Subunit: 273 residues, 6 copies
């Protein structure tokens, strides 16, 4: 009888350093959508809890000993305990969407969570069975796996917005989608420029698509799967193979286009309001 073993993984990950992208996003959306401070704090708590649950889960499914320079939650509590505590945070958040005083807030939650789970399922399937997805297939997974939280927060925040502003929905959903795509392409580029778990990325797909006969890359990508992780000399070989096909420049062009889209969307949004 107690909660000392349930809210231990939840509290450990909540005491770690963080960036605050998910909360600055709410703060930035609060400009066009005037909201009471209580509702903004509630949404911030919901976003933080969901992000913590996601971080807890995608560490066991990535065999990552460390997290922001400190050991992972499952490495201090256990895999089963971490899973049990992460499955409970979904129920806990379910009690907070009910405190937003709107029946429609649950439909948005139950739809966007389904979308996030579909995206993560596709990611997990491509990770387990080493099938390289196409560029279009990859870009729709991360529009749900990563941009799911942004859309979820946006749609519960134009709903509690005082009357008037409900038509300004599609543009913010597109903005959230572009943000989710950009925050994953940027992470892939950062991870490569500055693998071990054999996770496909936007630069790594172009190399495997443009060069159908690259037998070295397709073998170094399988040694990682078999052994469990690449050593530094093989990582340098992967980077050298990617620097030949021009995948990095392709990633930079994609990031530039994404940023142009973000600027255009923001400009239009201030143009209306």
């Amino acid at each position: 009888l107690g909660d000392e073993h349930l809210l231990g993984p939840a509290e450990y990950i909540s005491s770690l350093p963080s960036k605050g992208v998910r909360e600055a996003f709410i703060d930035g959306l609060n400009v066009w959508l005037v909201l009471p401070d209580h509702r903004v704090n509630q949404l911030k708590s919901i976003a933080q809890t969901l992000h913590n649950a996601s971080l807890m889960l995608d560490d066991i499914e990535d065999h990552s000993p460390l997290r922001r320079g400190r050991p992972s939650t499952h490495m201090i509590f256990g895999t089963e305990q971490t899973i049990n505590s992460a499955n409970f945070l979904l129920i806990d958040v379910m009690e907070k969407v009910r405190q937003l005083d709107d029946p429609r807030c649950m439909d948005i939650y139950l739809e966007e969570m389904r979308n996030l789970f579909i995206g993560q399922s596709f990611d997990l399937y491509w990770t387990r069975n080493g099938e390289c997805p196409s560029e279009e297939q990859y870009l729709d997974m991360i529009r749900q796996k990563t941009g799911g939280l942004f859309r979820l927060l946006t749609r519960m925040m134009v709903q509690i917005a005082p009357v008037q502003q409900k038509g300004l929905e599609t543009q913010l959903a597109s903005l959230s989608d572009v943000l989710g795509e950009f925050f994953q392409v940027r992470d892939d580029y950062k991870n490569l420029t500055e693998l071990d778990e054999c996770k496909f990325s936007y630069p790594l797909i172009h190399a495997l698509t443009s060069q159908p006969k690259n037998v070295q890359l397709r073998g170094i990508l399988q040694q990682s799967r078999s052994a469990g992780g690449l050593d530094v000399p093989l990582k340098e070989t992967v980077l050298s193979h990617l620097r030949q096909a021009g995948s990095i420049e392709y990633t930079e062009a994609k990031m530039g286009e994404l940023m142009e889209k973000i600027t255009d969307s923001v400009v239009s949004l201030e143009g209306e309001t």
Copy 2:
């Protein structure tokens, strides 16, 4: 694209089962009964999918487990979505009070499971009271959930019988857990404590053989046959196979009382 999310859920819902939860399920219309049976089935499937991973069980009902056909990560993802889908099913019941019942009962279930996992991993033997309180929530949580949800969608009249039925559900869950403890040795390997084992380790505070065998079981992944017979002999000598049947008889008497 929903083939890699609903897969494990379909696979585990196709294996042969007992249907005790469905057997358990007040003048209710048939449609509501089917809805509650679907909720119970999906919750049981999610519980089994999760429990198989935390016990490294390669087989279930003789057939292969879900995490040996799809992996552990996909099974975990499917279990979380199964919780979401049970949540969706509860919404269609058209009763605002099923909300709090479902959330509180799930919270109790998760607390019980967390306590069980902590006891299993850290090798700390709980007392009889702590063990009998864990299984009243981990195993009796589903029956309590179904009973409380069934009472609310029943036409008036049956409103003062919630307490009696909840007590009955708790005793029934306790009986099922103690029964599955009994019919696991007289018919551990996954470092799981039980009522006979707790009795043996409490009545014998200086028995080093049993504790050493348990420690060997911990850092080996399980016991082989001869050590299992040694454990059985120790329990039979300490009189824990017989102390268990007294609990089984007493629990049945309370069931008759309630």
Copy 3:
């Protein structure tokens, strides 16, 4: 001393055999009528090549047993077995030159090139977990498994006393069909009567007809992850094969290959 080099080469010879290649050599000798010592030399070449192939294959599949008895790499280690298999090629080079024919060496070279190409494709498909198509699979097993029969028959036509030369393409076709038949036979036997992630003819149809069977694809990946499958999972695979018409599609291939073999044999009775 030739004691650690010839060692693994004699253990694989001492083991009981099937003698299919020797019977095949005896089979094409009625048509080509060769002297006895040349036939013995050719049978020795076939035995050496088959033994080398078996020694190499047993290592590349982690097979602790062969014909009930232990494999060569469990009595002499992996490195010595590789060395002996490497030297058996050297020995076959000396054996071929005694046949007194410049063209025999070229034939031997081209056939071994084809065999190595086929084996390389098999290894690539096995390691990377990539499912070949039916056409690609039939092309691979035609070169890897029909390579020895093709080599033997092409050397037999050259060695055989002058005159008969037009019956070369017919015999090569017969050898290729027979090799494909043998491989499909072994595949069907293994499935009906995959622990090292080997793609089979029944399995390719199963994965091609159903582009959405996630259970079979997950069991195949579990095989790779654990380096083998346990018995209930093999039963699950067999059940999945017996529900997509993959065992009944193999028998049709078997019958067509038998009809082709019979037609090829018949056509060789009117050209005598």
Copy 4:
């Protein structure tokens, strides 16, 4: 397609090398005065043999790195690397057969026999943990790493335009002495400035001069069993070797070998 068969070969060719074989051929050329085209053919043969030898040695030594770059079997797997080495041996056939000499093949076969014998003895000594005698070790290095030099030497003298009557025994002796010196040099360089428990001249001298050094044998058995030596145990082995005086014995052997190298070179220069 040959994209999976020639992969490891081209990968190991891409890696940087030294060019000892090419320089040795160029050095013999001034005495033999071969035409350019035959010289390039011999360099191709030597390079292919060396690449195949390194490809096999990396597998049979569990070496994850080569020249600070990933090994071939870490990019293509063990089985594909073995198959590529086999095809590399099969490929050198056609380059010897394009040298336009029937006698050039018997030499190839015989020196390959000697090379495989030497490698088999090395593998036997490594696997079973048996310490060979000084003469036994010196003979095995004379055939193993003195095999390519001797093979190239005999082929060059056979191709060489006329003369070359007495220049067969002297050149062969130069070849074995050079191979022996190279093996001793590599042992010394690796030792002073193993992981796979490989025997060497300093180590054999230490185990022979001290019939009762239990610590050295225990550390060697720990290396054999565990799988490798950490830095402190390597330092302990080095301290034992310096105490026993094996390093100076090895250096004296190097000086003695270089004396005969210089004598052979001055003698050959004088005769012509």
Copy 5:
């Protein structure tokens, strides 16, 4: 078939750097007891043999690959040969005790080695089963394990010493026990401030007792137990958890109390015997 493969592990551990604490202890007690140099050398040799056997046995049951910065015995001679050598070392010591020319020296040996094994048994039991002992139980265990050699040597010297000095049994035994406690608490402090095998310690017992709800520390200890070793990030977390509860200063308080007791015992013995030792006062200065 003569020698070797038996004394080899015993000789390798003898050819190793050592501070020589027990030898200095014997030389400092000899001023109070006054023994011939021959018997002092015999006792010193007995001490080295017993200490070396203890080190050879304890390096096996810690999975320790190195000792003093050099490879251990079981990484050079194997576990079984090291066990055989350590077992023979007890029979070898029992030949030296018989050469001390006293029937009463065997009883002391056979009754002190029993206490040593009793303490080591509890140490091993706590280590294997991951059960935290109490502070009383941990201080009693180290008074029979690390204070066993000192007490054995002390009771042996006061039996061969020329008559008169027999009444000081109690004081020289209390000194041995407090010294044995101090040498283990100091080592325990040094390891933390300056748990790969998941061994309990005074700071760790204090942390696990004072905070009965710190689920993080117990989780990391169980992780160390399961994985057979803590990485550096986890050891930093353990060290941080031991500073949030004040275990480090509790260890200093215990050390100060122990040193006060040692100083008081030495001063009492000095007023009971005569001129100052100057030899126990110096090895006290080098803590």
Copy 6:
């Protein structure tokens, strides 16, 4: 932090530069508080009297001029001077010099001085300690018997021997400086000439007392002053011999000043740390000659006048594996091998406990999870606790042996256990390091590892039993050896007809030796060694090879011959 404070020193007003014909280029600075030097001096004499014995020769104390510390060290901190003058007195009274009392008192004064140094400044004291080791080591063990031939080689020895590094290293303590090894290896030859001056300076005024030495007593025939060396090359009378020494001392002395001047012109411009050192050392040369001109220690006869001015829990984890192995079913044959009834029962208990400990240890070095169909001891209690209990079982057997009252029962037990451990060590070496023993070597090992217990019991019972039988010792010992051999061969035979840890058996040795070229058997044995054990077909292959070698009949011939001897 390197200021040469002159306020704690007091220069002596000279008139003639020659200090009695020496040091015609230096002054002399006297220390101010020259009563800690006296205080420290007599404090050392008091402790030497109390612990070691009586003093006859004077140390370092001049009433008229002053203590050696004052004259030679002018630049020491006032509170670190008493300690220094204690080490200075210790050196003199010890180098020239019941048994237990003195040897125990010399380890007592040495630790008082050590404590004083290590309780004033720890890091500067450690460098003093190592310097003392060099001076002591270079005296006793460095071939005193060997003589000298020339001046240069004698000068090199009479540097580290006499004072110089010691006195210099003590000065830094009074100053507070420290030196890095790299720069220590730099000033090595710039201070070398200075040491020469101090050493030869002593020689001038130590020659008179040096008369009553080897040339006063023929028992010693060697000598070590430069004056006596000048007796060997030029053989001049002491007057002119010393006159040679007067000016050469200047050469070694004046040269040291020459590099001092040379140093300043060059790097000397910015060397604030080191130029302080050089100035201080230059005072030690005038200080030595000044003190060693009137000192009582070098002119004894002034005794009285010199002195006069001065005054005016429980066993539940230990006996846990020991009772489990004593509860498994047994087929005990050692009990049958075994007088008064109680003595017999004591012997049975000893044999049982020894066999139980042997089994406990053997099951660990075989990695066998099973024993007699029941789980092994280390699978219920672990390896560590089983090893700990099998180590105290020997002590328990020991207490049993003494109760079997006989002084001779101890020696038999110890020697028998020594033989048992030797046999087991050979077994373990052969098992691990893949080495095939010979037949004789194997047969000798099984005679000690397996026949050891029978020999132990027999030799105890021939001692305990009432007189009567006399010659029944060799017969029974031989019978026990044959019995142990027979039991081992039986166990080897039964393990095959009705390996997994690479254990050499009697048939296997014959198989490997009779056929020196069989590679299959050796390869399978190496596979067992590497992988960990043998699978079933591999075991059938090994048994087949043994049958073709005919090594099973060779084993049965040994059983019949052994049984015949019994």
